């Protein structure tokens, strides 16, 4: 694994940039909180600072890129408990009908401060949309989590 692939590095950049809202290279509690709220959580300031402290190896009070890689390494992997993707799916499936619509996905992107065209939203849906109905059902959401 000596070196990463560029596709891997790009994925990590994607992830980090989502949280680093102003693009300055560091994630603050303000930014962490703002994004978490968009994605369905409601952490307190103290909770956010505890999250930073766990991975703030240089003690400077904010999270840089390698610190963020460590944060993902510790919180994610996969495994362990699992099966509350239903809550994850619900952050998208805002009306609970079993299908993430284009308007629902745009709502999430709008909470995050992004303004997407219909084509860009459809492009996102095509990552998971096996049956071509322009929506992501739970089964499709589950498949997308284990694929590629």
């Amino acid at each position: 694994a000596d070196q990463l692939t560029e596709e891997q590095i790009a994925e990590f950049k994607e992830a980090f940039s989502l949280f680093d809202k102003d693009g300055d290279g560091t994630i603050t509690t303000k930014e962490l909180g703002t994004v978490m709220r968009s994605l369905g959580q409601n952490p307190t300031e103290a909770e956010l600072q505890d999250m930073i402290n766990e991975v703030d190896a240089d003690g400077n009070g904010t999270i840089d890129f390698p610190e963020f890689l460590t944060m993902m390494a510790r919180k994610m992997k996969d495994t362990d408990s699992e099966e509350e993707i239903r809550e994850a799916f619900r952050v998208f499936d805002k009306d609970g009908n079993g299908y993430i619509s284009a308007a629902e996905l745009r709502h999430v992107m709008t909470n995050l401060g992004e303004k997407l065209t219909d084509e860009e939203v459809d492009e996102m849906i095509r990552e998971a949309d096996i049956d071509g109905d322009g929506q992501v059902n739970y089964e499709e959401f589950v498949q997308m989590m284990t694929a590629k």
């Binding site: 994925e11 994607e14 992830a15 940039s17 989502l18 949280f19 994004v35 978490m36 994605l39 369905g40 959580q41 952490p43 909770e47 999250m51 993902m72 919180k75 994610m76 509350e84 993707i85 809550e87 994850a88 952050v91 998208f92 996905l105 999430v108 992004e114 996102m124 849906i125 990552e127 998971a128 992501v136 959401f141 997308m144 989590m145």
Partner: peptide, 20 residues
Amino acid sequence: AIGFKKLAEAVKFSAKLMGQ
């Protein structure tokens, strides 16, 4: 810029950060 898969991963990540 962010893809749907990575966004759903970020939703999951946000939940794990809360102890869920």
